[PDB]
Ligand binder design. Sequence first.
Ligand code: HEM
Ligand SMILES: CC1(C)[C@@H]2CC[C@@]1(C)C(=O)C2
Ligand SMILES: [K+]
Ligand SMILES: [K+]
Length: 407
Amino acid sequence: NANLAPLPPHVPEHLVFDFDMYNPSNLSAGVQEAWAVLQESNVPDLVWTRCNGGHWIATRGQLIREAYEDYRHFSSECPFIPREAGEAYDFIPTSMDPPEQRQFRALANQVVGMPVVDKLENRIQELACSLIESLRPQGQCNFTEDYAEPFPIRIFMLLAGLPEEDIPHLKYLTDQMTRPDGSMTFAEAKEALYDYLIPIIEQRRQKPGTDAISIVANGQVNGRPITSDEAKRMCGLLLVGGLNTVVNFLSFSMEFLAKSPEHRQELIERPERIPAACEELLRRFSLVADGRILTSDYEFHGVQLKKGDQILLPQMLSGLDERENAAPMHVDFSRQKVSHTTFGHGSHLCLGQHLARREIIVTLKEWLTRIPDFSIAPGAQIQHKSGIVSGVQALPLVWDPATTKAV
Ligand code: HEM
Ligand SMILES: CC1(C)[C@@H]2CC[C@@]1(C)C(=O)C2
Ligand SMILES: [K+]
Ligand SMILES: [K+]
């Protein structure tokens, strides 16, 4: 096939597995299911795909975790596939490895961490309730556009102090960086995101507000003032994380709940399990997959990796690995040890995970409280899209208003 890059001389031909992270062959079975083909009986722990320019792929949690811990060998400098995207990628602190990464990560943690999450509580609460109540009597909705997107995105735009009317443009840009439809390269999308931020950053460095952008823009990096460029590279990252992650995860979770009344009933009858349900769904419907670049030749698990080689370390796969969780594809809200790397692993552990869990848990209880019974619109063939961050194309839900209830 013309879509396969010539196998480099150092890569064993028996380790070739032409997986396409942007269009996996088994996609129709579900995106997680599609990626899980990498964990079928005769697939090695580490394979090489000739797709998207050619790159390694760690298929088991053990290797994924090990690689994310070894930043000296596996650098975040070029974290995205294809290589061109990885090279243009300069977001802070994600494109940096410790020790340099730390001073910036600390600043980022200050704008989206637990303390700020605690502060957004009521607003997150209020927004969830207002959106769901308005949908309730209608007995129908396009979940992705009617909740998954507006709920977490409006919260983020609130935190960032940006007008909601800017969401369409920003959402399109961040979409192109994770699930490219082809109308824009990662570099072009990045250039546009930065173009958007530049004047906003300059404005808030002059007239500081209390929003996340102002805090970053006027912040300090281990004692010294952050620069305009640094603030741009950090804010750009925050925007990408805030407009694509929780948005897509909510859809995977709700699609599942819509197709399984028994689980819904479990959460209805016993709402104290929602948090545990949240973690299990985070494991089962994990959706992120970025990676690293080899800093030098290095033998990893019996495989000769060469400097410059890119290796995809799918955060999504660790928790689906049967060597981490028995019956991985089964959703068990009572699962004893929910093992996963959904929020990453190592020095780059998701800073917005606390905000994400809050948004997910609030969604689960507030939705189930008002719309206990709902299903996927009859005949609907739900479609997933694969990428750095996988998602659900559309999720038409239906329900009988009579079975609902105001709160
Ligand atoms: C379902 C929700 C989310 C998932 C699954 C998720 C997942 C991840 C993953 C896997 C990484 C590590 C990437 C790497 O190691 O290269 C990461 C990093 C990060 N996430 Fe999230 N994330 C979520 C929500 C959020 C939200 C809402 C924000 C808020 C803006 C956010 C902010 C960040 C930041 C700033 C980093 C970079 C930290 C660093 O590089 O040191 N995330 N996230
Ligand atoms: C892989 C990610 C989820 C993480 C936050 C946004 C994202 C797409 C990045 O570029 C780093
Ligand atoms: K070879
Ligand atoms: K780079």
